Amino acid sequence: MQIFVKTLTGKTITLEVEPSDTIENVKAKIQDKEGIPPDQQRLIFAGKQLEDGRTLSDYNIQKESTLHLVLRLRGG
Amino acid sequence: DSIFVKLLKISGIILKTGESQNQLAVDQIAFQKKLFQTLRRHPSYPKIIEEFVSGLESYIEDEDSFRNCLLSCERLQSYSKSLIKLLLGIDILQPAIIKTLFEKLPEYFFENKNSDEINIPRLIVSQLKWLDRVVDGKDLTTKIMQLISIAPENLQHDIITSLPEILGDSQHADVGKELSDLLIENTSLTVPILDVLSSLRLDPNFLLKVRQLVMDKLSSIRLEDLPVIIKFILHSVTAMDTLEVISELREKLDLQHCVSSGQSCIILLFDVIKSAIRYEKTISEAWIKAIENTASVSEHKVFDLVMLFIIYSTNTQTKKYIDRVLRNKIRSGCIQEQ
Amino acid sequence: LLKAVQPLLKVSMSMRDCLILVLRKAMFANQLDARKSAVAGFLLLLKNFKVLYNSVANETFCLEIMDSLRRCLSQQADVRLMLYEGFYDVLRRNSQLANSVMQTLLSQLKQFYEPEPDLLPPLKLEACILTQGDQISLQEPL
């Protein structure tokens, strides 16, 4: 299914993931299609920071949902 | 067969077909210095660089070989920078490389995410980032600004958001002006320009001007824009303009007309405010001293409670002053249950 | 703090490659302290991170940092001056960087030295002054 990831600067990317996918799979896909390293990513959903080990099912993530990406350091 | 591929073979990088990451026989520094001194010792030294870039530009006309030339090198002794990035560190090749790199990019404005979903404009602009030397400022400045002018919206948004790591110190304030030239042109491009002007080097008078141009239109801003705006406002405050901008900020901020993305962006805004008050006492102390000066009117809002809890949590040396302000505020008939 | 920490960085490797990433991303900041913090970190890593782990994993690694230090020499006067005062200790505690370090200075000299005899001011002092918008600053303290 299709979800959205929104940066701090307002750039939105579209991610094709399933609820079986873990959060580090989303981080690796963001690294593959945007170049940001997965150690620098920090994801927020519904005012909750997404942990590394869990899945999309653990935080009730459905399709057309928007995550928020915060970088640990600036410009990567 | 070409002078380009032969000198790459001599300098210690193997140029493959186009389907996997290119090998590298020696260290990156050893390869760079060897290619430099081999171009130095060859006769017709000012003219061989034209043949070099001609061989390069004739080689990279194929999309796959050019995509391999943009990708990370395979290290035998295991990942490193790209061959374009390694050639970009050498100063004699650098301006011609920037010229040819900026030449063919409008061909790739519409063929985006072709095979394995990489953005070739994003790759070619990430070949520019974290440069150690920029040999010529002004030519690169005019080229990047005309690229921002001609590009479609999302790609030029990526060019904007990548500007602090590219540009050198000799070309900040020029791009200080010309970004503001783009700022009045579009309201859809307010926030990456605002983040860039928050992160570049600017003189405070221009920063005051653009801060007034932000602050007059604060009520016409949806919550999504509100972190990267307010960060910019808390890193444009001078030592003399503290109480004025804090009082105006605490007046104009609603946090109610905006209210799942809303709660997350609210948490991002309060993260931003914690980061602003953490390491600059001049905003924390002036925020606390700008709350007790609104003890007169009983109509102060939800913001002044959450902000007192934040500054009480974050900064430790202002704990007693926040405690005394809360006691003398609650004894005044102010902050109550409602 | 970076003097204290570095017995971690001789032991660890992930933390070392975290620090270099922090310092390289810190050189491109706008706040003034970040530039000079980055040069302090770079000079400490040049200083105590080998005499000359594997030596082949050091002689290239300092030659990485040294290329990063050719950013700082392009920056403003205080960030330069910390390098000019630090290079002597770098050479004392790390001898084999000498053939690189002197070159890093010598090219830095050549932007301001006019090597033709019988031209009477032998230095270019009109390039060591940055003038724009009636803001006059010293840069490159020759």
Side-chain angles (χ1 to χ4, degrees):
Chain A
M1 292 179 308
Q2 185 174 238
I3 69 161
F4 303 98
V5 172
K6 192 165 211 151
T7 62
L8 215 80
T9 80
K11 191 210 179 300
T12 31
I13 70 171
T14 56
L15 261 294
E16 306 328 315
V17 290
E18 279 329 312
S20 63
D21 300 309
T22 53
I23 303 303
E24 73 267 27
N25 298 53
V26 190
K27 288 178 180 184
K29 279 151 147 286
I30 287 167
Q31 182 191 31
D32 187 63
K33 75 205 307 156
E34 279 290 334
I36 283 167
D39 205 346
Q40 309 292 101
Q41 301 180 40
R42 175 205 162 174
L43 286 157
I44 311 290
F45 180 62
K48 292 184 291 207
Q49 179 180 13
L50 306 183
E51 265 170 81
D52 224 273
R54 310 298 325 118
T55 77
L56 264 67
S57 35
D58 299 291
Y59 303 101
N60 202 352
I61 308 173
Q62 297 149 205
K63 36 179 183 80
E64 301 149 348
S65 63
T66 41
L67 308 201
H68 289 275
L69 171 66
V70 180
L71 290 152
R72 206 185 65 244
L73 282 170
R74 191 209 77 259
Chain B
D1 208 76
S2 180
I3 178 166
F4 165 71
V5 56
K6 278 194 316 286
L7 198 46
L8 259 60
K9 279 163 43 61
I10 294 154
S11 61
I13 174 163
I14 306 97
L15 187 85
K16 285 193 288 186
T17 77
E19 287 324 288
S20 76
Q21 59 192 341
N22 300 14
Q23 317 96 315
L24 188 77
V26 285
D27 281 304
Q28 288 175 109
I29 301 100
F31 150 72
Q32 278 162 94
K33 71 173 309 176
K34 260 157 51 198
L35 176 54
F36 163 66
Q37 69 206 4
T38 315
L39 284 153
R40 278 295 295 268
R41 290 156 187 181
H42 207 95
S44 53
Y45 155 72
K47 201 53 65 188
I48 192 164
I49 316 298
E50 280 72 19
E51 303 188 33
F52 205 97
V53 301
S54 279
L56 160 75
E57 73 202 355
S58 49
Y59 166 63
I60 67 183
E61 281 182 63
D62 172 78
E63 195 156 300
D64 294 359
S65 50
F66 172 59
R67 179 205 60 197
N68 260 24
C69 194
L70 291 170
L71 279 185
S72 58
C73 279
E74 179 42 63
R75 184 80 182 88
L76 274 79
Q77 320 166 70
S78 285
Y79 302 144
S80 292
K81 285 170 304 300
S82 161
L83 165 65
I84 282 151
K85 194 148 207 80
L86 283 178
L87 255 61
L88 204 48
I90 308 183
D91 300 281
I92 44 175
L93 277 77
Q94 184 174 326
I97 281 178
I98 301 287
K99 163 193 177 178
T100 185
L101 218 56
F102 276 59
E103 204 90 1
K104 63 181 176 291
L105 186 48
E107 311 164 13
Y108 291 85
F109 278 164
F110 324 107
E111 292 86 0
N112 317 331
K113 273 198 214 185
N114 38 66
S115 53
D116 55 13
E117 304 320 285
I118 52 181
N119 186 21
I120 290 300
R122 183 153 66 250
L123 264 294
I124 202 174
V125 74
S126 49
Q127 294 304 308
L128 295 175
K129 300 185 211 179
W130 293 289
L131 270 181
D132 279 355
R133 290 187 66 188
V134 284
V135 278
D136 60 84
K138 298 300 297 166
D139 204 11
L140 176 50
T141 291
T142 65
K143 279 188 212 312
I144 199 155
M145 291 328 293
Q146 81 199 65
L147 210 166
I148 292 154
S149 197
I150 67 180
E153 190 46 63
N154 50 1
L155 309 106
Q156 75 159 290
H157 181 276
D158 295 291
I159 312 304
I160 291 306
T161 46
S162 58
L163 271 176
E165 291 81 8
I166 295 170
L167 298 167
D169 279 291
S170 67
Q171 46 180 8
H172 279 301
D174 182 37
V175 193
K177 301 190 321 295
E178 291 171 342
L179 279 166
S180 313
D181 215 334
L182 271 298
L183 192 50
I184 68 173
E185 187 200 289
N186 289 317
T187 190
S188 47
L189 213 55
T190 174
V191 287
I193 279 155
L194 272 181
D195 204 334
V196 162
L197 293 185
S198 175
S199 58
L200 284 191
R201 290 293 292 269
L202 305 162
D203 42 67
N205 51 62
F206 160 69
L207 197 61
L208 189 90
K209 169 186 183 176
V210 64
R211 199 263 309 280
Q212 285 173 351
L213 274 186
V214 167
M215 189 141 278
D216 72 295
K217 325 170 187 181
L218 194 145
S219 313
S220 49
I221 303 308
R222 85 191 79 183
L223 188 60
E224 294 180 355
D225 310 283
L226 269 180
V228 303
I229 285 174
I230 275 147
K231 161 205 296 183
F232 163 72
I233 304 177
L234 295 167
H235 306 322
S236 66
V237 66
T238 70
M240 63 211 51
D241 211 315
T242 61
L243 261 75
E244 182 174 321
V245 77
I246 283 183
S247 300
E248 183 65 25
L249 186 55
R250 212 165 47 77
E251 184 44 71
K252 273 224 174 174
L253 271 176
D254 43 2
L255 265 190
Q256 287 172 357
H257 309 129
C258 48
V259 190
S260 316
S261 163
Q263 51 194 3
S264 313
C265 212
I266 276 166
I267 290 187
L268 293 193
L269 164 60
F270 284 112
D271 183 31
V272 158
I273 296 178
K274 283 182 282 186
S275 59
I277 68 153
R278 183 88 46 77
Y279 294 117
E280 303 183 327
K281 278 199 100 84
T282 323
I283 312 175
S284 72
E285 278 191 357
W287 198 290
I288 301 156
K289 287 183 67 65
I291 288 173
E292 67 176 66
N293 297 328
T294 321
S296 45
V297 63
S298 174
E299 199 67 43
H300 41 85
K301 283 302 302 167
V302 191
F303 205 45
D304 285 38
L305 256 184
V306 190
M307 201 54 58
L308 278 172
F309 293 139
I310 280 172
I311 305 166
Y312 188 81
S313 62
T314 293
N315 268 277
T316 324
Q317 307 318 287
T318 184
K319 278 209 180 188
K320 301 310 151 276
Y321 188 51
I322 291 168
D323 211 329
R324 179 204 279 97
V325 155
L326 197 53
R327 272 167 156 84
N328 301 347
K329 187 65 76 74
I330 197 173
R331 285 181 185 169
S332 73
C334 283
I335 305 143
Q336 325 87 334
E337 175 81 332
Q338 65 266 19
Chain C
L1 171 60
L2 289 180
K3 282 184 203 295
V5 156
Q6 278 164 4
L8 260 172
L9 306 181
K10 288 170 200 164
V11 170
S12 159
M13 203 73 40
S14 82
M15 194 156 308
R16 208 266 324 286
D17 293 4
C18 171
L19 183 56
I20 307 154
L21 177 62
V22 162
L23 295 178
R24 195 175 287 106
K25 268 183 200 241
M27 285 191 290
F28 298 94
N30 49 9
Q31 59 197 0
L32 185 43
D33 298 336
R35 303 280 183 91
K36 309 197 207 160
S37 316
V39 184
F42 276 138
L43 287 173
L44 278 154
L45 277 179
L46 279 192
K47 216 172 290 185
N48 77 332
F49 217 80
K50 215 227 163 192
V51 197
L52 286 91
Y53 214 63
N54 291 316
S55 184
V56 294
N58 288 115
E59 64 181 6
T60 184
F61 150 73
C62 293
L63 273 175
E64 199 200 327
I65 282 180
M66 192 64 68
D67 198 20
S68 299
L69 283 188
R70 298 169 205 164
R71 186 76 182 175
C72 296
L73 292 166
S74 73
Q75 298 184 314
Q76 55 191 346
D78 304 351
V79 187
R80 276 154 147 162
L81 199 144
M82 295 195 60
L83 277 168
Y84 297 146
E85 295 186 336
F87 275 152
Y88 185 80
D89 218 342
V90 160
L91 289 202
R92 202 164 74 241
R93 213 194 308 278
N94 206 354
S95 62
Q96 275 95 323
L97 293 184
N99 290 265
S100 181
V101 163
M102 221 79 73
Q103 286 298 334
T104 319
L105 296 166
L106 203 149
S107 61
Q108 189 77 16
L109 188 47
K110 289 249 170 183
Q111 312 179 14
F112 309 99
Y113 175 47
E114 312 162 335
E116 66 294 338
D118 293 324
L119 205 53
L120 215 51
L123 309 171
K124 178 55 70 190
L125 316 177
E126 287 84 357
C128 303
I129 291 155
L130 189 141
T131 314
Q132 103 282 15
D134 206 353
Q135 311 157 323
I136 297 94
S137 296
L138 167 66
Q139 76 174 354
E140 211 280 313
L142 207 155

